Structure formats: structure tokens, C-alpha cells
Design a protein around this ligand. Structure first.
Ligand SMILES: CC(C)c1c(Cc2ccccc2)n(COCc2ccccc2)c(=O)[nH]c1=O
Lengths: 547, 408
């Protein structure tokens, strides 16, 4: 019952007092139950009736799950100290190593098995109402369910108790996750069973009760999201709720559930579905599925039938990661040891970052993978990337920002990532030189964008409802539009200075994306920047006419 | 007896999350920590302790054994408060690691809780191992300060036997400066060294703050003038006497970038005057102790980097270049970290404090691999930035040896 362990010293937050909230009134039928239950517990020694000298109180409730008692610690909780709860690092199946056999022990009710710091028990006081008359007063002697520190303290205690056993039997792996203890080994079945019984008797020595054969959990293990089988893990099938009426809320739920599936199912698409949220007036508003959406929702239903199973980890084999570009700014990867035998898969998105490029992006996918690998496997994978080592070397070497990719190889799996264009280092000798310039009135938004070339060619365009940044970029666009396969372009635009340094191939501004298109069409392009408002010729005659 | 140490007023302990560690480093930390625990230097702690500092492991620039490095930056910032200028003069400085001395001294028990740290578990299968210090930790600034009194003693005999040699201590390291020749230096080091055991190569003068040099040229193209003018104009933020009107006048016209332009006697002079101006560091830039030291680095490319230490923008205290060391050919991160360590050390020697770094790298990239190449006992502050195109173009223009530095 109650374990002979050293309590953990627990305190209330810096400047606070114990809770003293009133006991929500109960019918005569309910008080009758709460009395039975508490009389049981008091005997087991889990709660002790206390004098009235205790000013604190926490409301208790009775709910028919026959009958069951519930205490509302919301108050005590919010005013209890904080604990080191960094255990919010959930393992991933692909990280588990294979086991000949695995046994799972239940240590649930064993929470009332750990004693509460007797100096803190006083705040845990609660009251059993009466048909207004006296009222029965109790307090906890053990870790109360639902109290902020129970999980932390119990886990820590479990850890102390398993210290001896783990030490003696290092060939036995034990994972602790709440009321569960997953014990696995590679010992022959009879030996494994002999050890579990050994551990069980050990635990029993520490008061921790033993799960009845009736409550013995068995594989496959359904672990929040998956089915852990002895030799492989699978993902619980995801069912799409079929209806003949779809409200905004239903749709968002759908889209969200479908977005998480994208990871293990790269095929999933949600455009026509997401497109149905346009202009929505209320969550309850019903929306008729367009034909394209209808079509889309159907395909997804299909792809979600296929079983996606992964495999466990083998520390004696290499870790390999392969990446694919599925479109602009979206990648897919699968990490494995043996081909086809995937440890796991995934996909990355991104939203028209102000301005980047496919190599930069490939770079970011790589590190994202690398981190989670270090988390899941303690090491970084060997990479198989769809990029030429020449393309990479050419890029990185000149990029303005530090960057890197761990050990990798080239895998000729199309489409290969490449540089769409590269600015000329020097001015193109036989090319026309376009002096561009744009100016706008930030108040009126009346602007002018234009150019003049060394060949006598000129053009001025007037724009309404425009900004300065745009007249400048538009002027660059006009130059690219009217020029041949080779052009030299001088502008005083600071932003253009950025394009030169970053040389992006994706942008948030569609004007900048139109310019990128033009830049990709040319063979040679040399972009030069110079100070605005200066005497600098060319950028003084075109610059003066568009002002 | 232990001296009582308190956090600054209104501060609470650090609660910094532990970054993922690779398995090799986790095993190493377990080994290092079980050992330390036996010796009672650290103690396992419970969950009632909410505090936490990140720890990691490195292999110092001379080692095949892992060392444990704790990031006490946060704690330090929160710890209560408590430089022989000749050190930056001396023609020779050697850094010594006296960090182990602290483990001999106990830490005020009331303060021990703030030193809590966690050894993580792969795939989070196991809970982390939580420890806390009983003795003065390394990396913590409170350590050299408390062990100060003791350090003065053990050192006194040597100081007095050589009032020449200057000893300065920063964090876990001891800096020794003398002017004796190499052999003459190294020998006096071993004396000092042995005196230390008994109880239980830098050259500051080569750090010349090199000048900027404009390109001289037989012929000049429109493109060249423009490039030149763009950089000058920007430089006038540092040197207000820089002029470009004469050069911008030679550019009057819509000419082809490749077209050559002959300079006027005026554009000549204006250009000559600008070179003159650039021959020396801007006047009146002195160091202010009460201000932070900033260090910003630019990736120049092909293995080259540039930096500047300053407190006020454009008023540099020191500028420089740095080329990767053989081996870092394919790693920008490795290079960059090497640059930081070098710059930081120069700062310590000179001003006796670490600068705050403005690094030209993506946060995620840096946090993921910097510790893999880190080798110092200290860790400076740093922030990540976007290099303005011009700040990079200007310092590319800095002078270099006509030959270099000769060995047979
Ligand atoms: C933590 C340990 C004990 C562990 C397990 C259990 C486990 C089960 C649920 C949640 C986490 C872990 N498994 C899951 O394998 C399921 C299985 C294996 C063998 C026989 C039946 C089922 C594994 O492959 N390796 C392991 O090391």
C-alpha cells in the first residue's frame, strides 16, 4: 500500500497561502458515497481526518464514472511551486531498439503509494458536507491524483526504486511513462519472465501493488498514435468523417487532421478544401463542397487506407537520410538503415519567405532533420541529397551567410535542386547598359519608373497608387522586359543591393517574383548599384526625368 | 567555511533548456559525472529544483578525453558582482588553465541549487540525470572571485621573484605576459606551472589595426568609378573628409559600364586626398569601460572573414581579417567558431572582457554545431545578423602584406 520512501520537500509559490475554497454542496445520496470511499482510504492511511484548526479547503466531488470521488485541486495547483517538468520529450517509435520480448507493468493506483511531504499535507485539506451541520474533514498523506506535483514526484521516486534493479540487470531496458512501465529484454522468454517476476517482487517490497492478471496489458501496444508490434510499428488508421453537410468548423478540423497526416502520407492535398474557408461568416455556417473539393476529399480517403508501417532501430547499422523536392519550398525525406525499411518519414513546408533560394532551403531541411535525429538516435544521418556537389560548392562558397551540410552524397533522383540564375561578376561587355530609376510621392502614391540606355533607348511609365520601393523595382522590371539576352543594369535601389547579395529565386512580393522570372530567362545579367541623389550620370538624367 | 553568494536583486535562477546532445557526448558526460559524484563534487537532485543550466562536452585543443563545459552565461548574468594594461603590450602571452583549482573549494550551500543541470537521454526513453554543485564550478564567474584571495597567495612568491612578468586571470584561464625570448619565456612558464602543481603562444604586438587601401589602377572604367564611389560614399560615415563630387562628375552621362574614363587633375587630387585620409584610424576613439564591447563578423568568402570590435558604430577599436586554418575547407561553422575564439581571446588580453558577437549565420545552424568545434572554457554572448552589402565590401578593401610573414 503506502511505500516507505523519503518524501520530496514541496513548497507553495513564493508569496502565497494554501487554498480555501468553499465545498460545492452535495445531495444526501452523494455524501453517502464520499463517506464510504473516504472511510476506506483513511484506513489504508491515504487520508487522515483533521482538526478544524486547518483553514484551507479544496472542493471534492462525486461522479458516477457505480460511484467515484473527485477532488478539484485547480487552486492548490496554480499556487504550488513549479517542478522540473522537462519530461515533455516524447520518444518516437523509430527510436526504440528492437526487443526479443517486452512486458508492461501497471503502476497506476501506486500513486497513492508515495507519501506526500508531511509538511505540505496540510494544504491538501478537503471537506465532506452534511445534510448545515458539522461536515467531515480529511487531508492527504500521499500523492493526490490531479495535484500539480504528483507526476513529477512519482516519476522521480520510481526512478530511485528502479536504481538497484537496473544496476544489477543492465541487460534489461525499462521505460517509464505514467502508470506504465515498459520492460523489455533480449533474454529467452523463460528468462525474461523470470526477471519480470523478480522485478515485481522487488517493487512489492516497496509497497507498490501488483497489477491483477485481469488488468494485464498485452501487445500490440497502442501508444498514443501507433501500434507497436514486436517487429514493426504501424500507425493507427485515420478515419475521415463522411457527411452530407460541412460546416466551417467541420472543415477546419478536417484540414487540420489532414495536415498532420501529410507527414506520414506525402500525397495528401488540401487546396480545394482550404479554398472553401474563403469569406466564411461563422463556424457553424454550412458550406457546399465544390466539385474539386469533393474530388480531393475522396482521393485523400483512398491514400489514407494504405498501411504506413515503420521499423525499429539497430545501433549496428548506418543511419541514412534521403531528401526530395516535391515542389517549390516543399520537401520530403525518409530515414532508413535498410532500403524500403523506413525508420520514419516527413515533409517540410514554408511560406514565401521574403526571399530565399532552393539551396538555402535544402540547407534548412537538412539541419531540421539533423536535429531531430540527434534527439531520436543520438547521431546525425549520412545524407543522400538531390543536388550536384558542384552546385553546392558554387553556392555556399560565395553566399554571404555561414552555412553547412554534414556528410552527404549526390543521388540523381529528379528533379535535382539547382541555381536558377547567377549574376555576372563583371559588366557584360557587348551588352546594353540600362540606367533605371523610379520615384514616387509617398503621400499621393503617384510614381514614375523608367530607364535610359547608352544606346539612346528610353521609356518612362507613370503609375498611380504606388510606393517608392515599387517604382524602383518596376524600373528594373522594365529594363529586363525590354532588353535582350544580356544586359547591364545600374540602379540606386537599396533593395536591389539585397538581390545582388542574396540572389533569391523565391519571394513574398510577386513583383520581385516577376523580376526573378525575367532574371532566369536571360543568359547574362550584371546588376550594379550606386548611390542615389548623387551626381552619377545616367542615374541623374533618367533619375531626374522620373522625379 | 564558505562565503555566501547571492543572486542580484530581484533575480531568479536560470531555467535554460538543455539542447540535444549526441550519444558520444552523453556517455562521456555520464562517465565524467559519476566520477565527480563519488568525489562528492556534485550531488544528484530532485524535481523540486526547477532551475537548470545547459551542459555539453568538448575535446580541448589538445585532447583525446572529453571535458565537461557548462553554459553559465545566464547564471553569471544573474550572479552578484564582486586589468594590467601591460598584458596587451608584452611581446609574449601564454594562457594557462587553472579551472581545476576551484573544485577544491566548497560552494555556499544556499546557492548550490542554482547550479542545477541535466544530462539528457537519447530518444527521451529515460529521465535526465539531474545534478547540482557542492564546490566552485568552472565557467561560473563567482569562482575566480572567491578563489581570488587564495590565488593571490599561491601566486605571490612568483610575482615577487619576477616583477617583470605580468599575470592576469580571466575566468578559468591564467594569462602570463613577458618579453623574454621564446625559450626564455617558456622556461619561466614551467617554473610557475610547477609551483602550481606543487599546491594541488600569443604575441600581442602583431595585432596591428590595419588600414583600408583603395585600388590603384592604370585605367578606369565607368563600372570601376561607380564601385569605388559607392564604397567611398559609405566610408564617409567614418571619415567625413572623404569627397566624391569630382568622381561623380566624371560619371555625368549614360555610358557603357565598360567604357574607360580618363580622370581629371581634380578627380585625381580628390582621390589622392581620400587615400591620405585612410592612412590612419579615425581620431579620438578611446575605450569606455562602462560600455559593452561589440564584435561583428562578415563572411568575405573563399575562406576569409573580417571583423571589427567597437562600442560606438564606426568608431572601431580594432579591425581585422582571418583566414581559415587548414582542415576547415568545407565547414563555415568550424571556421566561424575558430574566429570567435580568437577574437574573444584578443579582447580578453586587450580589454579583459568578452565582446558580444553579431554572427552572420542562422541561429538554428549555429546552435546545432558550434559546440562540436568549441574549445574554450568560456562562452561569449552572441546574436545573429544580416550583413549589409557595403559593410562587407569596405573591409574587403583592407591592406595586406606585400609578401606576408617569412620562414625559411
Ligand atoms: C521501452 C522498451 C521496453 C521497448 C519497447 C516497448 C514500448 C511500448 C510502448 C511505448 C514505448 C515503448 N518496444 C516496443 O516493442 C513492442 C513489442 C516488442 C516485443 C514484443 C511485443 C511488442 C521496443 O521495440 N523496444 C523497447 O526497447
Amino acid at each position: 500500500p503506502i511505500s516507505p520512501i523519503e518524501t520530496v520537500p514541496v513548497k507553495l509559490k513564493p508569496g502565497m497561502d494554501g487554498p480555501k475554497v468553499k465545498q460545492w454542496p452535495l445531495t444526501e445520496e452523494k455524501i453517502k458515497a464520499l463517506v464510504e470511499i473516504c472511510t476506506e482510504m483513511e484506513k489504508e492511511g491515504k487520508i487522515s481526518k483533521i482538526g478544524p484548526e486547518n483553514p484551507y479547503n479544496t472542493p471534492v466531488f462525486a461522479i458516477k464514472k457505480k460511484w467515484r470521488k473527485l477532488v478539484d485541486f485547480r487552486e492548490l495547483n496554480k499556487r504550488t511551486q513549479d517542478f522540473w517538468e522537462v519530461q515533455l520529450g516524447i520518444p518516437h517509435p523509430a527510436g526504440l531498439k528492437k526487443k526479443k520480448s517486452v512486458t508492461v507493468l501497471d503502476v497506476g493506483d501506486a500513486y497513492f503509494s508515495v507519501p506526500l511531504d508531511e509538511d505540505f499535507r496540510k494544504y491538501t485539506a478537503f471537506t465532506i458536507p452534511s445534510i448545515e451541520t458539522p461536515g467531515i474533514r480529511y487531508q492527504y498523506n500521499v500523492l493526490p491524483q490531479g495535484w500539480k506535483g504528483s507526476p513529477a514526484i512519482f516519476q522521480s521516486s520510481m526512478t530511485k526504486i528502479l536504481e538497484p534493479f537496473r544496476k544489477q540487470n543492465p541487460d534489461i531496458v525499462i521505460c517509464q511513462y505514467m502508470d506504465d512501465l515498459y520492460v523489455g529484454s533480449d533474454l529467452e522468454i523463460g528468462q525474461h519472465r523470470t526477471k519480470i517476476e523478480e522485478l515485481r517482487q522487488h517493487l512489492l517490497r516497496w509497497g507498490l501493488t501488483t497489477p491483477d492478471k485481469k488488468h494485464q496489458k498485452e501487445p500490440p501496444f497502442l501508444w498514443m498514435g501507433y501500434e507497436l508490434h514486436p517487429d514493426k510499428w504501424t500507425v493507427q488508421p485515420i478515419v475521415l468523417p463522411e457527411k452530407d453537410s460541412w460546416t466551417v468548423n467541420d472543415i477546419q478540423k478536417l484540414v487540420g487532421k489532414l495536415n498532420w497526416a501529410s507527414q506520414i502520407y506525402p500525397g495528401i492535398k488540401v487546396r480545394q478544401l482550404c479554398k472553401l474557408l474563403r469569406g466564411t461568416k461563422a463556424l457553424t455556417e454550412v458550406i457546399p463542397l465544390t466539385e474539386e473539393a469533393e474530388l480531393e476529399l475522396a482521393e485523400n480517403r483512398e491514400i489514407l487506407k494504405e498501411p504506413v508501417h515503420g521499423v525499429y532501430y539497430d545501433p549496428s547499422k548506418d543511419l541514412i537520410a534521403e531528401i526530395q523536392k516535391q515542389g517549390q519550398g516543399q520537401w520530403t525525406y525518409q530515414i532508413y538503415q535498410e532500403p524500403f525499411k523506413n525508420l520514419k518519414t516527413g515533409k517540410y513546408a514554408r511560406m514565401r519567405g521574403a526571399h530565399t533560394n532552393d539551396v538555402k532551403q535544402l540547407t534548412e531541411a537538412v539541419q531540421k532533420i539533423t536535429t531531430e535525429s540527434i534527439v531520436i538516435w543520438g547521431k546525425t544521418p549520412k545524407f543522400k541529397l538531390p543536388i550536384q556537389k558542384e552546385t553546392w560548392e558554387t553556392w555556399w562558397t560565395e553566399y554571404w551567410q555561414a552555412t553547412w551540410i554534414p556528410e552527404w552524397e549526390f543521388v540523381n533522383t529528379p528533379p535535382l535542386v539547382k541555381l536558377w540564375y547567377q549574376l555576372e561578376k563583371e559588366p557584360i561587355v557587348g551588352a546594353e547598359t540600362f540606367y533605371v530609376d523610379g520615384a514616387a510621392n509617398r503621400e499621393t502614391k503617384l510614381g514614375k519608373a523608367g530607364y535610359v540606355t547608352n544606346r539612346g533607348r528610353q521609356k518612362v511609365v507613370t503609375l498611380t497608387d504606388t510606393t517608392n520601393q515599387k517604382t524602383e523595382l518596376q524600373a528594373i522590371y522594365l529594363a529586363l522586359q525590354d532588353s535582350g539576352l544580356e544586359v547591364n543594369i545600374v540602379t540606386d535601389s537599396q533593395y536591389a543591393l539585397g538581390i545582388i547579395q542574396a540572389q533569391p529565386d523565391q519571394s513574398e512580393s510577386e513583383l520581385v517574383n516577376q523580376i526573378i522570372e525575367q532574371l532566369i530567362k536571360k543568359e547574362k545579367v550584371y546588376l550594379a548599384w550606386v548611390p542615389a541623389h548623387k551626381g552619377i550620370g545616367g542615374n541623374e538624367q533618367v533619375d531626374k526625368l522620373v522625379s | 567555511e564558505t562565503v555566501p553568494v547571492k543572486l542580484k536583486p530581484g533575480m531568479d535562477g536560470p531555467k535554460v533548456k538543455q539542447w540535444p546532445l549526441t550519444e558520444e557526448k552523453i556517455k562521456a558526460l555520464v562517465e565524467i559525472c559519476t566520477e565527480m559524484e563519488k568525489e562528492g563534487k556534485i550531488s544528484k537532485i530532485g524535481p523540486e529544483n526547477p532551475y537548470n543550466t545547459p551542459v555539453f562536452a568538448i575535446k580541448k585543443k589538445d585532447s583525446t578525453k572529453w571535458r565537461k563545459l557548462v553554459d553559465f552565461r545566464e547564471l553569471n548574468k544573474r550572479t552578484q558582482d564582486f586589468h594590467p594594461a601591460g598584458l596587451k603590450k608584452k611581446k609574449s602571452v601564454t594562457v594557462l588553465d587553472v579551472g581545476d583549482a576551484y573544485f577544491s573549494v566548497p560552494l555556499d550551500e544556499d546557492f548550490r541549487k542554482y547550479t542545477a543541470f541535466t544530462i539528457p537521454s537519447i530518444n527521451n526513453e529515460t529521465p535526465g540525470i539531474r545534478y547540482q554543485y557542492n564546490v566552485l564550478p568552472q565557467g561560473w564567474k563567482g569562482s575566480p572571485a572567491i578563489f581570488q584571495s587564495s590565488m593571490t597567495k599561491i601566486l605571490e612568491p612568483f610575482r615577487k621573484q619576477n616583477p617583470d612578468i605580468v599575470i592576469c586571470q580571466y575566468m578559468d584561464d591564467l594569462y602570463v605576459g613577458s618579453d623574454l625570448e621564446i625559450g626564455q619565456h617558456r622556461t619561466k612558464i614551467e617554473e610557475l606551472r610547477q609551483h602550481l602543481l606543487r599546491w594541488g603562444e600569443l604575441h600581442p604586438d602583431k595585432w596591428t589595426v590595419q588600414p583600408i587601401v583603395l585600388p590603384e589602377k592604370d585605367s578606369w572604367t565607368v563600372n570601376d568609378i561607380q564601385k569605388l564611389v559607392g564604397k567611398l560614399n559609405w566610408a564617409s560615415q567614418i571619415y567625413p573628409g572623404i569627397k566624391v563630387r569630382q568622381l561623380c562628375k566624371l560619371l555625368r552621362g549614360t555610358k557603357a559600364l565598360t567604357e574607360v574614363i580618363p580622370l581629371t587633375e581634380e578627380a585625381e587630387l580628390e582621390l589622392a586626398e581620400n587615400r591620405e585620409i585612410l592612412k590612419e584610424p579615425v581620431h579620438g576613439v578611446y575605450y569606455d569601460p562602462s560600455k559593452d564591447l561589440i564584435a561583428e563578423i562578415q563572411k568575405q568568402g573563399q575562406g576569409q572573414w573580417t571583423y571589427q570590435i567597437y562600442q560606438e558604430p564606426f568608431k572601431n577599436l580594432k579591425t581585422g581579417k582571418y583566414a581559415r586554418m587548414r582542415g576547415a575547407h568545407t565547414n563555415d561553422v568550424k571556421q566561424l567558431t575558430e574566429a570567435v575564439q580568437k577574437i574573444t581571446t584578443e579582447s580578453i588580453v586587450i580589454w579583459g572582457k568578452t565582446p558580444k558577437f553579431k554572427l552572420p549565420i542562422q541561429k538554428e545552424t549555429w546552435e546545432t554545431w558550434w559546440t562540436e568545434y568549441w574549445q574554450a572554457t568560456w562562452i561569449p554572448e552572441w546574436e545573429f545578423v544580416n550583413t549589409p552589402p557595403l559593410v562587407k565590401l569596405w573591409y574587403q578593401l583592407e591592406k595586406e602584406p606585400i609578401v606576408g610573414a617569412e620562414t625559411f
